[PDB]
Design a binder for this molecule. Structure first.
Ligand SMILES: Oc1ccc(/C=C/c2cc(O)cc(O)c2)cc1
Ligand SMILES: Oc1ccc(/C=C/c2cc(O)cc(O)c2)cc1
Lengths: 388, 388
């Protein structure tokens, strides 16, 4: 019994494959068109008339038609400090996150496990990602409790990473499944805006844009290598992963977990940073495959905001339809941070099937998934579609 | 170019190996024998002479001779709220962590890199663990900037997992190293008690024992598969990993990150709970190897408290020598959370090389590393030593 024999008989043989995808969102649906009226009223800023008009323009150009929020008029009426712009409110928000994050997360995981069709007891690893986690144990522990998974599921919680973490969990899931024979990784991203909601300030118009973009949602996947045919159904294959920090971007997107909750900073130069740095990311990802035409692959980009998508599109002269799946999710759910790119994969495989195309990847063969966040960090995931 | 082809050329070949280890602690060294006097004073509790007696009792049974603390008398003086039992202090604490966690971490990383000998440019992944992290980007990003690592180093932050995370970062590095050819992983655990320090209250003695046990420290590792002959020197090889949740232990160890900072709680039976489940963790790890004599392997156990070591030793009837390296770290450093097990690995290989033994693992071939924390969780890492 050498380390050699053990090592060989311990790893998996094939690439990490996404075998199921399920999503969930709080029940409360908030229409974008009339959110301003609602927001300024609930945050007692109906006098800030001049600033409201500014928020209306932000929503009207957000390219989002609705979002789902755990925060309701009733809940907010119960927590006035969360409605103020900058008041001590962390403890209240932590109580909300302790319950909703795992609840919404479980709901998505249940749909995913049901599509997968195998015993939940076969889940060997669990990755749970959220913008923040309120306590110790982290939310990965609470989700395992709710799901009733085996006590020995290997857990990894991914917290305070941010909007690019959808790529992060996929990069993490790829290695856990590829290096371990028989491993089946349940991946869950669950983001709830109770962590970021706050009143408006006619001084932080930069932060005000987060309130017009951020929505709630949870997305779950089952990832594994060496799919069992007649028992499992591959959706996408992961090929290669990368993570990088854009130069001259320190402070473009950051946050501070404080007594008043999670404060956030957004810079208007974010879309430019992403656009200026996207070609580089692609070359590194696709040149090895000998791919130069970026319209010959399917696309999944974190919809941080509509400008990021527009400028990436122009930069690479992408056909207008490349970003359809990404804009569809932005339109129906808003920016759900880490969960976005997972909803997009689901929308894409679903639309591809619904409409009888060649592969789950809009008929195309190769594809890419991008996550953007604090750093500014860029996560890259090369994917391969599956024949329908 | 096929995914199947890419996979084969993309993965590493052998077991993840620890190539270097370096540690660091704040300069302020606090002796345990006189801590009660210092503590009850800085926390204006001089008058509760009785509780000051109960703490001195705790510090005496602690088996800790001293600890290193970033928090100095002066600093606490500037931060009166951190010296209360439960007053709004999170914002003050975050400022401290934002600076010290990364500073101490870089200090340990630099030492690890020096032992290693290769350019830090060869580092491909970075795992940074700390009980908490103050903002977004997480401390992993800050460490990357401070060390001057390449901007495309793949990061993963391990936050709010707890005392068992020393095992967790080992479990993660193993998959990242083994599944990526050429991968060189910098692992860093950095823990600073500015997150947990608080005045005493005779109503939460479980919180008080935290004050007699928790110390500060950072430890760094370099992990990679396929060491380059006569350039890199292996220290230990990782063979197998596991993580499990002990039955009926929920509530034994937990915390809440709130406005008053991070609390800590216990159900005081933690020691029995670890003892009771340890054999089963050991069986699962070693039956597969025909090893049943736990005195025939080397030991690394997270020193949450002296009683845990005593009970594991009692129950397994281990020779007093087994827990020596472990108890020596607890003695000179106290409980540094996630960092402990890494300081212990360093102590074990040093003492083994110093006593002219045949392996880095006290002359033995196989060994075990145990991490324990919120959950209650038990992390297991099976190691193999290297001939010296
Ligand atoms: O449901 C959710 C949807 C989005 C978010 C975003 C959070 C966030 C936090 C930061 O510090 C910076 C930032 O750019 C974004 C959180 C929850
Ligand atoms: O330097 C440091 C060393 C150790 C710690 C430990 C904190 C901690 C907090 C919890 O809520 C639960 C727990 O199991 C541990 C903090 C700082």
């Amino acid at each position: 019994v050498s380390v050699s024999e053990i090592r060989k008989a311990q790893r998996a043989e094939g690439p990490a494959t996404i075998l199921a995808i399920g999503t969930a969102n709080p029940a409360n649906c908030v229409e974008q068109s009339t959110y301003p009226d609602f927001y300024f009223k609930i945050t007692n800023s109906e006098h800030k008339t001049e600033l409201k008009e500014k928020f209306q323009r932000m929503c009207d150009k957000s390219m989002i038609k609705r979002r789902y929020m755990y925060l309701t008029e009733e809940i907010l009426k119960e927590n006035p400090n969360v409605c103020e712009y900058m008041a001590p409110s962390l403890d209240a928000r932590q109580a909300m996150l302790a319950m909703e994050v795992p609840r919404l997360g479980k709901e998505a995981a249940v749909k995913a496990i049901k599509e997968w069709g195998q015993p939940k007891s076969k889940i060997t690893h669990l990755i749970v990602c959220s913008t923040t986690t309120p306590d110790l144990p982290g939310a990965d522990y609470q989700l395992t409790k709710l799901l009733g998974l085996r006590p020995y599921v290997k857990r990894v919680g991914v917290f305070q990473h941010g909007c690019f973490a959808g790529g992060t969990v996929l990069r993490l899931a790829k290695d856990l499944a590829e290096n371990n024979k028989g491993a089946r990784v349940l991946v869950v991203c669950s983001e709830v805006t109770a962590v970021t909601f706050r009143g408006p300030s006619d001084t932080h118009l930069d932060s005000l844009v987060g309130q017009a973009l951020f929505g709630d949602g949870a997305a779950a996947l089952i990832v594994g290598s060496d799919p069992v045919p007649e028992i499992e159904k591959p959706i996408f294959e992961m090929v290669w992963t990368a993570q990088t920090i854009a130069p001259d971007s320190e402070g473009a997107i950051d946050g501070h977990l404080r007594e008043a909750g999670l404060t956030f900073h957004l810079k208007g130069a974010v879309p430019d940073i992403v656009s200026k740095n996207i070609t580089k990311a692609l070359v590194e990802a696709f040149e090895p495959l000998g791919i130069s035409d970026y319209n010959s692959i399917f696309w999944i980009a974190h919809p941080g905001g509509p400008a990021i998508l527009d400028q990436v599109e122009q930069k690479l002269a992408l056909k207008p339809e490349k970003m359809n799946a990404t804009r569809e999710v932005l339109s129906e759910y808003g920016n759900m941070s880490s969960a976005c790119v997972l909803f997009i994969l689901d929308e894409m495989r679903k639309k591809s099937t619904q409409n009888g195309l060649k592969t789950t990847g809009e008929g195309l063969e190769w594809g890419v998934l991008f996550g953007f966040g604090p750093g500014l960090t860029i996560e890259t995931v090369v994917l391969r579609s599956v024949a329908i």
